[PDB]
Design a protein around this ligand. Sequence first.
Ligand code: HEM
Length: 181
Amino acid sequence: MKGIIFNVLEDMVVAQCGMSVWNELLEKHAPKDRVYVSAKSYAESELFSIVQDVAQRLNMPIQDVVKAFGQFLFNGLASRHTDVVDKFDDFTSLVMGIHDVIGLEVNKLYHEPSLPHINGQLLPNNQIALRYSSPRRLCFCAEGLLFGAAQHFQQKIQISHDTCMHTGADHCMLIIELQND
Ligand code: HEM
């Protein structure tokens, strides 16, 4: 438990460095007294430092770790909001439906303010254009999630994240393409 985001990640660390390290950087950073749930607040702001700590332990760049957590995050989630997934018959529908159906669905589950700005579209050459913009700059995760989704549905895609606010552009551009286009 403890934050759905931190929950899936907690498990991932239990597999890599183990629960012992998870508690070491957590108790050092996050509170040992305060306990959250897979439905309570989940300030990602703290995550960044967490994915960095563990990254220092795996001796991997923070960008490669966060990316991974994104993939894992889609997996475990498909278990939580599974009913919400069984609404989409394919990877594509999910990409053009993200904020729309999934977001809408989330709102029904809980109040919540507003989800990041996400816009998807379909292309003729079996491609899907996805636009992701958020001040959290968690874009790296975005890719991880998308890549994971496809895999779940036995699909092999490629995401070209050329435009990235990291530069200062209007937003992030994630071009997707289906294998054997
Ligand atoms: C491939 C599909 C999905 C994509 C591409 C996606 C992408 C993202 C991204 C990148 C963020 C914003 C992080 C940020 O701006 O800091 C996010 C947050 C979130 N997503 Fe998804 N998501 C997907 C599916 C879902 C699913 C499985 C659920 C619904 C059950 C969901 C639940 C959430 C929640 C609750 C947050 C946290 C919001 C917050 O803490 O501010 N997403 N997602």
